[PDB]
């Protein structure tokens, strides 16, 4: 009873945002709480932020 089938594929890109879950390899997991502007971050003697 089936004449035809049409399949459509949609692609999207997801960026990182507060509420996403991150982890290391040692069981240290967490959730992102805030995206901080570049000049608010701690930096070293050469001006390189983390």
């Amino acid at each position: 009873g089936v004449l035809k089938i049409v399949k459509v594929y949609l692609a999207v890109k997801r960026r990182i945002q507060p509420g996403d879950k991150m982890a290391g390899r040692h069981g240290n997991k967490g959730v992102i709480s805030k995206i901080n502007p570049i000049e608010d971050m701690p930096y070293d003697e050469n001006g390189t932020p983390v």
Binding site: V2, L3, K4, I5, V6, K7, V8, Y9, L10, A11, V12
Partner: protein
């Protein structure tokens, strides 16, 4: 009667059919959001009795409108993306369209 996959839907505007090709299937690379039409399809609803009002409707707005109804595939609400691939499967013995 069989359902037809077509680009000619009587109850939708010209703008809503702009992203469909001649076969009633969306183009590759189109940006779509919730509510947009991907595949246009109609379902038969014809009857063998024609009332005077039905005759007036057919005379003024055409016979295609009075025979079929919209059953198209639409993007679910809250979904967006880009069309990157389309596949068509046709039963053996049925004629193939341009896209296939």
């Amino acid at each position: 009667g069989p359902e037809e996959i077509t680009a000619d839907i009587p109850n939708v505007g010209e703008a809503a059919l702009s992203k469909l090709d001649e076969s009633g299937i969306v183009y590759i690379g189109a940006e779509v959001t919730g509510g947009d039409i991907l595949v246009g399809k109609v379902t038969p609803k014809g009857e063998t009795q024609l009332t005077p009002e039905e005759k007036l409707l057919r005379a003024i707005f055409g016979e295609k409108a009075s025979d079929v109804k919209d059953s198209s595939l639409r993007v679910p609400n809250g979904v967006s993306g880009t069309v990157i691939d389309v596949q068509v499967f046709t039963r053996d013995g049925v004629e193939k369209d341009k896209r296939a």
